Amino acid sequence: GSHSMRYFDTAMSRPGRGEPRFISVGYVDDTQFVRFDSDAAWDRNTQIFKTNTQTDRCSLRNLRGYYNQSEAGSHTLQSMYGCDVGPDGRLLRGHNQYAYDGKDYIALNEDLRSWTAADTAAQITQRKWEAARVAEQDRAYLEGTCVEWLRRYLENGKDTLERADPPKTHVTHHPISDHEATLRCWALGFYPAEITLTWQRDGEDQTQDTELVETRPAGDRTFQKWAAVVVPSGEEQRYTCHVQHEGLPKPLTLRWE
C-alpha cells in the first residue's frame, strides 16, 4: 500500500502556569512510533525535540506580537510535517504546515520551495523564512531523511505496518416504533483507519439519511465505525451496506439477516 510518516506537534502557552507545553507525536500511518512531551517526567533525536520545544516557545512569543495580543491569554501553535510514499517507496509528496489558534497560518507548498501565508502576520514568517532559506532545509529533510526513515521503519515493522487487517462486519436491527427501524452496519477490528462504509436503498446511495460516526480507535491498534439508516418496517431487504477496506480480498455487500 501507500504509507505516510507524520508528526503532529502542539505548543500551548499557559500564562502564570510556566512555559508553554510542547508535545510532538510521530506516526507511521495510524501507528504512533514516538512521543516527546516537555511536561513528561537516542541522544541526537532527544536533543532535536528539546531544541524544538525552545523553537516553538520562540514562535509563540513572536505570534503573540504579530497579532497584537495580550500576555494574559493562552494560545496554541500546531504543526504537521512529513512525507507520503507509494507502494514502491518513492516520494509522493512532503508536508510542513502550521496553524495558530486553530486557523491555518503558513504551509510549505507541494513544490517544497515556496510558502503560502494566510494573513499579514504569516507574511512576516514567510519573509523571514525566505531570507534564511528555510524551505531548502525542509525540502532536504522531507525528500531525504523522512523518506529514508519511513522506508526503514516499514521494512523493520513489515509484519504490522504493512499488514492491513480487514473489518469484521455485521448488521443490527432495532425498531424505533411500529412504523420504522434502525439498521446499523458495523466494521470492527480494521487497520489502517481508512474505510468506506455506506448504505444504499434500491442501489441508490443514502448519504443524507445515513448517520455515520467518526472512525474510532479500539486501543488494540485497530479501528471501529458504524453507519445507520432508519427504514420503514418491512422494507429492510431493499437496504444494502457496502464496505471497502485494504484488508478485504473483495468489497462486502451486507444486508440484515
Binding site: 532535536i48 520562540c58 525542509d138 529533510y141
Partner: peptide, 10 residues
C-alpha cells in the same frame, strides 16, 4: 541520521 525534523521559529 536523526528522524526528528529541526524546526525554525515563526
Amino acid at each position: 541520521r536523526a528522524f526528528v525534523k529541526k524546526k525554525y521559529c515563526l
